[PDB]
Every structure is written in structure tokens, then in C-alpha cells.
Amino acid sequence: PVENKNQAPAPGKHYFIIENLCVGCGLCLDKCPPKVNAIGYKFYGDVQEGGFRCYIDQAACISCSACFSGDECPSGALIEVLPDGEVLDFSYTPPERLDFDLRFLHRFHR
Amino acid sequence: GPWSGNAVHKAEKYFITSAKRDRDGKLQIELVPASGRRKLSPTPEMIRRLIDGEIEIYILTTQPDIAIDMNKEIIDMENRYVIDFDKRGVKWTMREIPVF
Amino acid sequence: LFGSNDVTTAHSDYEIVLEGGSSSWGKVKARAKVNAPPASPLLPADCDVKLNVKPLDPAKGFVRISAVFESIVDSTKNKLTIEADIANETKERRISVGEGMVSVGDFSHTFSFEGSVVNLFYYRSDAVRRNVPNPIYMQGRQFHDILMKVPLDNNDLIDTWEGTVKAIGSTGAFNDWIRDFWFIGPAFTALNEGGQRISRIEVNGLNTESGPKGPVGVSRWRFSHGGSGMVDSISRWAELFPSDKLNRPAQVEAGFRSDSQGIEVKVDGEFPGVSVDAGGGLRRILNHPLIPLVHHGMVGKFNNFNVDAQLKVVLPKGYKIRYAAPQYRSQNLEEYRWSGGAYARWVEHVCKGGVGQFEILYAQ
Amino acid sequence: STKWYQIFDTEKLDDEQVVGGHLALLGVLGFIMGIYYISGIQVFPWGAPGFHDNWFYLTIKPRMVSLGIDTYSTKTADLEAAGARLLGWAAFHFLVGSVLIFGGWRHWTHNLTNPFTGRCGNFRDFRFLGKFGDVVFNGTSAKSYKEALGPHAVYMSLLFLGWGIVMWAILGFAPIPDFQTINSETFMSFVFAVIFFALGIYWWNNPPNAAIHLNDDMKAAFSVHLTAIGYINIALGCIAFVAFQQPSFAPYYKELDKLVFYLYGEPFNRVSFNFVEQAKEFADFPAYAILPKSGEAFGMARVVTNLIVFNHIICGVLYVFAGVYHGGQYLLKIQLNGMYNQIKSIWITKGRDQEVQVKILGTVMALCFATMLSVYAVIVWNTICELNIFGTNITMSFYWLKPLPIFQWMFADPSINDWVMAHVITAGSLFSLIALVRIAFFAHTSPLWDDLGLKKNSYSFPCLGPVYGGTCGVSIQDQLWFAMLWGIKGLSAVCWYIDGAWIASMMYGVPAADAKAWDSIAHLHHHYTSGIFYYFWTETVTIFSSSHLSTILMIGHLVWFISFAVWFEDRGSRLEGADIQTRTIRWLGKKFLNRDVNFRFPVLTISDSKLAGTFLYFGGTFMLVFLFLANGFYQTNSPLPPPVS
């Protein structure tokens, strides 16, 4: 009989890099502001065999997190340590899955 | 297979935090996977996984060195540390700040 | 025109290869791909279940089962392995001695258990078995006397054991509230939704013993699992246990992979109790246990779906199909394939938890 | 990094946004069609001459002839009627395109208000029409692409029925089932209306489920539809080539050879340095006026057929490549998002296992290598035999190798040329499919990058550095560029075959002996224009004759060898050179400027350098292939005699 009013428009930090893992691509350098210059190349030997790696100057590097948030690392050397101590290779790693294939017996994929 | 989990790592990459040598040896050595959401302990089942090859634990450098002479003292190249003294362990090296 | 649009689709295949003669063996291969979201609060759940079983010497019986569950849930790895010798002492009692181990993520513990399960129907009337061809509902109750021993090698085990020791003495309502703990998730809902009732456990005294291979917490407890009649674990005690049919080892390699967009189920298995003899010389595929159907009904009614289901009963050359309702779609000389129409309706019925019959009677 | 080619990316667009974009594009396309129709007015209805036969209109023309428009008439009155119909239909296209642009703007702003009735139409929920929508659907597709296929097919059925009606009333083509004559396309339009209405109602009552696309439709559905429509466009090109060669289309295409055309840029009558218009070659035509180019010699019928067929074919191949690339982008997105393990459909789960990817790509590579080696050895051996080096006459060549008699039905004159054409098309298809499969399967990790611990984290990353002495061009964008470069060969084979050329050998028709004796020993009633290398020499006669085609030649060549600069591994050299350029431009200081020169010389990123390189490479290549197809057909039905009896 009686009802109340309604409206509803719905309907109608201290980042580190593991030189053992790093391969020296330098996208961290591109992700770093030029004013800081924290990422730097360190040369070890022949360039074609891996050669140079990259390093962070902890004093110069002040909590930008652009490198890791960009998630551009192919090698996973760009790691982030946390105040509690956990280490991150990637911002979000895919979950590990128990992989086993599906083949219907009567369907064409058997 | 490779797409499940972090695609870089063949085995589950378990970094070792600097939990060490502060109270009766600190047997609760912190093992953290690459995912990093959980923070596990080095129970014998984790050692079973590690000897199975499904997971692999790695020691980092830029931290208080984790029982570096109490876990194992093989220092031929400073990276010959093994848990059960026949492990074939691998250490991650980071001379981050000390190098130019 | 039509109603209930925007339905998802589930594609399912089943194959039951029966064995002729007095052997009631069957080979069940099932596949399923459902595009409906799963009801997992920790959604990315993939579990592989390897249920092997071997005939130990039948002088006393004690067939040996070996179950390996490996479940990755939210990128958490769990594994439960149990190897146990089980034997029907008498028709009503069963005695088992086994070992096992759980291992979640990092924490693992091994247990050695012995168990006496006395199953009694609330009634055994000659008139009922005289008047009904097949009693699917049967009222009864199980009494489990379980003695489980766990070495307390890990500190987590020690803390939990101390907590349990304090709890069993500080609170008498523990015997009740342990049931509240006994159902980790919606299993408490499935208990009453499935017709099962669980009585308060009666502790016979859990004690620690000093073992050379680590200290062992040895807990003896008995609990009563009463059934309204839908419970396969009670009403079908004669079944569930190939006491004399295990003349050969049997296996199951089941598994599922569940994630935000779908569910992928693959079952391979060889079971010794697929076929049940019936009166008049007829043999049938065993009546579906109703606890699976009902417990699946809770999650099966969460989305509107259409099913494309096929089933092939590879019948032995010595038998001809009978009394198949729904009827068979494709008729081979020996095989019989059910698909579409009424069978699809039955699949949609049992996917949502409907306890319906699919009578398939094969005879000479 | 959002660039100027990422602002219109679908990830930032909604469904209504792309609806508005498609409608704006349809309206702009209608405006362009009006431009072309006006450009086809041979004699103005005012009583004056018209436009000089644009290639756009020369392509559009036969289809217009199929309709009541655009009579093939030299009679001035009927040609004026043709111009009147063209202009009227152009104005109608202009009006409809204006309304379509208005609707596209309304859907771009998400501002859907009807001026006559002040109500707001919800994009998520509405009725298609006042009563028809309630008759058929009773509502709207619930914001899911799978539920929209039904209504989309119903709309397509409506459009087919409307096309039949337009043919029935305005263009005066009564539907009869005689498929040889024109007046059955309307009957088939009605048949397709019935069929697609049935399909639409079925798909509305029963929506097909491929749940991969629904979530991120903006890329998954885009990729699937783009690849499907690319294959559809390839099929349309093939069907067009077959049909335009049929006698049924002959009244509408062979008559194009009968009539001459005055093209824009076609050479004019040349006046001398002293022409007193108060000496002139071809004095009958006025000064600086276009000399007529005869269709019979130019082969305008097959020239227009080739333009249409290769336009659709290359557009389809490019659409296939772009569909694969955008599907790779979506797959990379779900691989970084962790949804790749959660798709649960055959189109992904089969490729989820890396060993299956290895097997598929290895099978493709083996087939490509085998077919390519076979056909290339055949080609080079034919060339060797016809040039007689190493003392081999053409009797040792692959002239015996005809297509199988069972398979001979689909060729005019069975020869090694058709064999090599088919084998080259299959080899190039598999050659591009190698890179397409690489995009499909290796968007995140290749088996090498699985063994060597790297992974692709972007769709436009340049490389991974000099580690392992490589890592160049493993991005799906770079694999797309390689696929395009590899399919350039296949598209070139298509163009040269449809234009008419001996692909089975390289120098066919050169003054060498056994090159000329090919036709004598092959028994062909068709004289193919020339061999692969001699094709340029034989077909650039007209390209040089026409100043306009020469201008296109020069511009395309410039574009190509400018692509060279960004294709090579020279970006760092260009960067340091640009820094030197900037330093000297700063040295314009103390050259009396007193102005701070804040102009850093820019150098493209590698992800942008490859983009520009491929765009300019393809652009120059096929700007020149346009001249290949605009030189002429120049195929005479006369076998060559042997040089020596």
C-alpha cells in the first residue's frame, strides 16, 4: 500500500638486483629518473657472453619503486626486500598449477 | 608447466632472509618464495622438496650473512654452502653498493 | 520466447567398460570441462588423487589401499599419502591398520592409525527386502573407534598437542565443539544438507608416549556417524568394499583443475564394484551413491548451465542392455551410448544435486 | 609508455566507445564514397566534362555497372544519366554518412538523448526498435559479446533484406533465380536474410560459448574477428579473381577493355618549347591534355580485377597478421596477469603445453623447409637450364612437372608455373605461419627463454640485451614485423601470378636461347609476360612511360631505403650522431643567436624503429606493387616460336 522513496539509475624498500641473474639490458636505467642515476652498468668481461650487469647505489636510490612496479625485468634479478624481509622477483607471480591435460574420449580431441 | 608460477624459475625460487645467529642458532631460518606472500620455515618437508628439485633455496648477499660459517664453511669460491653437507647449494651474489 | 538466458556450458564424457562373466569389474574414464566459476574462496585449486589398491593375501583379507592427494590451492602445496590394510572382520565390522602423512607447504606430520568401525543398520527387516527390489535409502549408524599416533617431531605438533591436552580437560563442551572444528568449511552445512548426523565424540584418553623415534601423541577416540538413509557410507556397507572382488590390483588417477574461468575434471579408474547382480538374472550398474550427488548439489545450483554429455557403456559380448531409462541414443552391436535429450536432462538434474535414477540393467 | 599509436588503443575504450568509433568510420567511409562517386562523373549534368578516371573510381566502376548506375555508354545523353545517378547516390551517401557520424559522436560521448523525446537510452539495456525489438528479443544482449552475435546476425539479415528492397525499388532489379544474370544477387540477398535471421534467432536463444573473449573482449574478440575476417578477405579476393574471369561477369568487366580512359597523370600531348597558343605533338588534342590509353592494349579489365583482388588479398593477409599480433598481445597480458593458466578452453589449453608448441612449430618449420627447398631448387634449376650454365639445356628443366590431372581443373594452362605458384604460396604461408605461431605460443617464454631464465614482459620491448650474443627482436611486435616481411614474398607471388608472370623461372623471355624456347617446349597457349627478374624490365616500360607511375616509383623507393636506416642495428650510432648534431646546433651559439637552443635531436626507440621500418618497408614495396598492377596486363595469347627450328 505505502512505500518509501527510492532512486536507482541502474536499469534502462631498498631494492636490489642479483647480478648472477641479471643479463644487462638496462631497462631499469630507462625506468630511473635521470636526476638520481641509481642504476649503473658494471663490466666484467666479453659483452656477448653476458658481460656487464647492473647495480643500484643504495644511498642515491631513494624509494621510487618505478623499476619493480614497471615489472620489466626478464631475468627476475630485480628484487624487492620488505621491512619484514620477504623478497619479490615480480609484483604478481602467476599461481603454481598442477598441470595435466584433458582429452575427451568421444570428442574429436581424444 | 613454465607458465604456472613465475616463468623464469624452473624450481620454486625460495630466497633466504637474514634470520640467523641471534638466539640458539635461530633454527627458524626464514624461507620466502618468489611469490613472497607466505614466510615459511626450513622444516624437513621443505628439505624433501629441495632434494626433490621441485624447489630451490638461495642465499642472498646484501644482508647479515646467514649463519655463513655455521650452516656450512666450504668457501672455495665463497659460494659452496650446503645444508645437509651434500646439497649442491647455490648462492645469489649482490655486490650492489660496494661496487662503484 | 525462452527464458533464463546467458547460460554457461559444461561438456562431459563418460565411459564404463564392463567385464563379462561373474567378474563385476569396470573401467571408468570420465572427462569434464565446466565454464562456470568454482565455489572456492581460494580459487586456483588443482588436486590430483591417486587411489591405488592392491590385494593383500586373502587368508585374512586386509586389502591394502594407497591414497595420494596432491592439491595446490592459492599456490599452497598440500599432499596427503595414506597406505592402510583394511579388512572386513565380520559383515558389520571392519578393522584397519595404516600409516599416512600430511604435508602442507612446509609442515608435515606422519600418523599410524588403527580403526574398528562397527556399522549397524537401525533395522534389518525380512519384509523390506522381500517387498522392495533395491533399497537405496537405508537407515543406520557407524561407530568408529580410532587410535591415531603422531610423532611430535615438529614444534607445531608439540604446541598443538599441549593445546589439545589442555582443552580436553578444561572444557567438557569440547566433545561438542570439536564437531564445529571438524568441518573446516561449508562441510557443516553439507552435513545436515546431506542427511548425515555426527554425534559428540567420546575420548578414551589421549596420552603422550616417549618413543625412540621421537615422542608420539597417541589419541584414542570414538565417534558415531548416523545416517538418515542417503549416506552411502552406511546404507551401502555391503558395497564400498570389494572384499572378494580384488583378485587384481585397481587404480584411480582422478583429478581436477579449478580456476576463475572454469573447472577441468579427469578421472581414470578401474573399480571392482561397478556391477551389482539383481533378481531375475539381471545385472545393473550400481546405484549412484547419493552423498556425492547431494554434496555436489550445494555447488551445482550456483549457475545456470547447459550440458553436452556423452556416455559409453562398453557392455560385454555376453550381455544385452535392458530397462535403460533414459534410453540409449546410439546402439552398437555390443557398446551402448547414451547422449542428449532425456540423458542430458538427467545430467543437468544430477549436476545440481538431483538424486535421480539412471537404471541400466544388463543381462545374458 | 602511451604513444600516439596507443591513445586509440582498445584497452582505454569501452563498448560504446568502439561503437561510436565504428559509426564515425562508417560515416567517413560514406563521405569518401561520395567523393569517389563524384570522381566518377564522366560528364557533368551541368553540360560540361567530368573527372579524369581515378583509380579509386576505376575500381568502383564495374560494381556500379552491375547496378542501374554507371552505363558503359559513349553516348553523351546516357553518360549524363550515369553522372546524374552517380551524383544523386553520392549525395545520399553524404547524408547517410553525416547521420552516421552524428551517431558515432553521440556514442563516443556516451550522450544518448533523443531530441524529440527527452529520454536517455541506456547502452546496457534497451529495445532495438519500438515494437520489433520486443517482437524478437524482448530486451538487449546483456553486455556480453557471445549474447550479441544473435542480434548482430539479425541486424545483418535486416541489412540484406534492405539491400534486396533497394535493388527491387530504386535500382530496379527484380529477383529471379537466374544466377548468371545480375538480377539474382537480390534474390540471394533475400535468401541470406532468411538464413541469417534464422541463425540470429538461434544464437540469441542459444548463445555460443567461447569464454576466452568475453572478459577482455577488447583484444581477444578483436584478434579473433580480425583473423577470421582476414581469411574472409582472402577468400573474397580468390572468389573475385575466379568470378571476374567468368563469362557471367564479362558484360560488366570485359567491356571495360572496350572503352578507353583518360587517367590522371597519364602522359599528356607534349607541346614544344615554343607553342604559340594565341608546335604541339598530337595537335588534335588540346595542349597538355591526356592522351587516351586504350583498354584493349592496357588490359583494363584484368588491371581492375587485379587491383580489387590484391587489395582484398593483402588486406586479408595484414588482418591475419594483426589478429595474430593482437592475440599475442592479449596472451601476453593474461600470461603476466596469471590468467593464461585459467582460460579453460581448447584454443588455449592445447597450446598451454610447451612441448605441443614445439611439435607444432617444428612440423610447420619442416613443411616450410621441405616445400621451400623443393620449389626453390626447381626455380633455380629451371633458371640454370634456360641460361644453359653448367651445360644444361631446358630439356633438363622442370617443364615435364605439370600439376596432377586430378588437380588440373583449377588452372587455365597447366604448367610448371602454376605448380611453382602453388608451392610458393604454400611455402610462404608456412613461412609466415612460423612467426605467427611464434607470436601465438611464445608471447611470454620461448623454450630457449625457458631454458635460459628470461621472459618477455612487454608487447613492445626492444630486446633483452647482448646476453648470449643475441636477444634481438623476440618481442611479439618484432615477430609480427618478421611475419610481415616473410609474407611480403607470398603477396609478391600472388601479385605476379595474377598479373601474369613466369614464377617457375627467373629470366624467362630474355634474349638467351633456352629462355625463349620455354614456351616452345611447354606447349602453352598463354604467353606469360616474363620471368621473375625479367618482369621488372618488361613491366616498367609503361611505368616509365607514365610520369605519374614513375613518381610513385621514386617515392616508394625513397620510402624503402629510408626504412633501411631504422631497420638495421644502428640505433646507438644514430643516438650518438644525434648528440653530436645537438652539440653543433648548440654551437650555433656564438653564431649571433642569443637564443637557448632547447632542441634535442630525437632518435626513435628500437620498438619504434622497427615499427617505422616495417611500415616504410611495406609501404614502399606495395606502393611499387600498385605500379606492378597498374602497368597493365600485357598478356598476349600467342605461343613463342623456338629461336632455332
Ligand code: BCL
Ligand atoms: C554451475 C554448475 C556446474 C559445476 C560447478 C561447480 C562448482 C561451483 C564447484 C564444483 C566443484 C566440483 N565439481 Mg562441478 N559443476 C558442474 C558439473 C560437474 C561435473 C560434470 C560436468 O559431470 C563434474 C565431473 C564435476 C565435478 C566437480 C569436482 C571436480 C569438484 C568437487 C570436488 C570434490 O569431490 O571434493 C570432495 C570434497 C570433500 C570430500 C570434502 C572434504 C572436506 C570435509 C571437511 C571432510 C569430508 C570427509 C572426509 C573426506 C572423510 C575422510 C576419511 C574417510 C575415512 C574417507 N562437476 C555443473 C555443470 N563444480 C567444486 C570444487 O571443488 O571447486 C573447486 C565447486 O566449488
Ligand code: BCL
Ligand atoms: C566419509 C564418510 C564417513 C566415513 C566413513 C568410512 C567408511 C565407509 C570407512 C571408513 C574407514 C575409516 N575411517 Mg571414516 N568416515 C568419516 C570420517 C572419518 C574421519 C574424519 C574426517 O575425522 C576419520 C579420521 C576417519 C577414520 C577412519 C579410519 C579409522 C578407517 C580407515 C581409513 C583409511 O584407510 O583411510 C584411507 C583413506 C582413503 C582411501 C582416502 C579416500 C577416501 C574415499 C572415500 C575413497 C573413495 C573410493 C573410490 C570411490 C573408489 C576407489 C577405487 C580405487 C581403485 C581404490 N573417518 C565420515 C564420517 N570411514 C574404513 C573402516 O571401516 O576402517 C576400519 C571404512 O571402510
Ligand code: BCL
Ligand atoms: C576409507 C574409504 C572407504 C570407502 C569409501 C567409499 C564411499 C563412501 C563410496 C565408495 C565407492 C566405491 N568404492 Mg570404496 N571405500 C573403501 C574401500 C574400497 C576399496 C578397497 C579394496 O580398498 C575399493 C577398491 C573400493 C571401490 C569402490 C567401488 C565399489 C565404489 C565405486 C564404484 C564406481 O563406479 O566408482 C566410480 C567412481 C569414480 C569414477 C569417482 C572417484 C572419485 C574420487 C577419486 C574418490 C571419491 C572421494 C572424493 C570425491 C575425493 C577425495 C576427497 C578426500 C581427498 C578424501 N572401495 C574404503 C575402506 N567407497 C562409492 C560407491 O558408489 O559406493 C557404492 C562411494 O560413494
Ligand code: BCL
Ligand atoms: C572488417 C571490420 C573489422 C574492423 C575494422 C576496423 C577499421 C578499418 C578501423 C577500425 C577501428 C577501430 N576498431 Mg575495428 N574492426 C573489427 C573488429 C573490432 C573489434 C572487435 C570485434 O572486438 C573491436 C573492439 C574493434 C575496435 C576498434 C577500435 C580500435 C577502433 C574504433 C574506436 C575508436 O573510436 O577509435 C578511435 C579512432 C578512430 C575511430 C579514428 C582514428 C583515425 C583514423 C581513421 C585511423 C585509421 C587507422 C588505419 C589507417 C586503418 C586502416 C585499414 C587498412 C587500410 C587496411 N574492432 C572488424 C573485424 N576497425 C579504427 C581504428 O581507429 O583503427 C586503429 C579503424 O581504422
Ligand code: BCL
Ligand atoms: C545514425 C544511426 C546510428 C545511431 C544513432 C543514434 C542516435 C542519433 C540516437 C541513438 C539512440 C540510442 N542508441 Mg544508437 N545508433 C546506431 C546504432 C546503435 C546500436 C547498435 C544497433 O549497435 C546501439 C547499441 C545503439 C544504442 C542506442 C540506444 C541506447 C539509444 C536508443 C534507446 C532506445 O530504446 O531506442 C529505440 C531505438 C533504438 C535502439 C535505435 C537503434 C539504432 C537504429 C538502427 C537507428 C536509430 C536512428 C535513425 C536515424 C532512425 C531511423 C532508423 C531506421 C528506421 C532503421 N545505437 C545507428 C547505426 N542512436 C537514441 C537515443 O538515445 O534515444 C533515447 C538517439 O538519440
Ligand code: BCL
Ligand atoms: C556503410 C558505410 C557507408 C557506405 C559505404 C559504401 C561502401 C564502402 C560501398 C558502398 C557501396 C554501395 N552503397 Mg553505400 N554506404 C553507406 C550508405 C548506403 C546506404 C544506406 C541507406 O545506408 C545505401 C542504400 C547505400 C547504397 C550502396 C550501393 C549504391 C552500393 C552497393 C551496395 C551493395 O552491394 O551492398 C551489398 C549488401 C549486402 C552484401 C548486404 C548488407 C550487408 C551485410 C549484412 C554485411 C555482410 C556483407 C559485407 C558487406 C561483405 C562481407 C562478405 C563476407 C563474406 C562476410 N549506401 C554508408 C554511409 N557504400 C559499394 C560500392 O560503391 O561498390 C562499388 C561499396 O562497396
Ligand code: BCL
Ligand atoms: C578457426 C577460426 C579462427 C580462429 C579462432 C580463434 C579463437 C576462437 C581463439 C583464437 C586464439 C588465438 N589465435 Mg586464432 N583463429 C583462426 C586463425 C589463426 C591463425 C592462423 C593463421 O591460422 C593463427 C596463427 C591464430 C592465432 C591465435 C593465437 C594468438 C591464439 C591461440 C593460441 C593457442 O595456444 O593456440 C593453441 C592452438 C590450437 C588450439 C590449434 C588447434 C585449433 C582447433 C581448436 C582444433 C581443430 C583444428 C585442426 C588442428 C586443423 C584442421 C581442421 C580445420 C577445420 C582447418 N589464429 C581462425 C581465423 N583464435 C585465442 C585467443 O586467445 O585469442 C586472443 C582464441 O580465443
Ligand code: G2O
Ligand atoms: C634519403 C635518405 C636518407 C636521409 C635523408 C638520411 C639522413 C641522415 N642520417 Mg641516414 N641512413 C640511410 C638513408 C638516409 N639518411 C640508409 C639507407 C641507412 C642504412 C645504413 C642509414 C643509416 C644511418 C646511421 C647508422 C646514422 C645516420 C645518420 C643521419 C644524419 C645525421 C647528419 C648527416 O649525416 O647528414 C647528412 C644527410 C642529409 C643531408 C639528409 C637530409 C637531406 C638528404 C640529403 C635527403 C632528403 C630526403 C628526405 C628527408 C626524405 C623525405 C622528405 C620529406 C617527405 C620529409 C642525417 C641527416 C646518423 C647521424 O646522426 O650522424 C651521421 C647516424 O649515426 N644514418
Ligand code: SF4
Ligand atoms: S627506486 Fe627510484 S632511485 Fe632507485 S633505481 Fe628505481 S627509479 Fe632509481
Ligand code: SF4
Ligand atoms: S630489467 Fe632485469 S635484466 Fe634488465 S637490467 Fe634490470 S635487473 Fe637486469
Ligand SMILES: [Ca+2]
Ligand atoms: Ca604488370
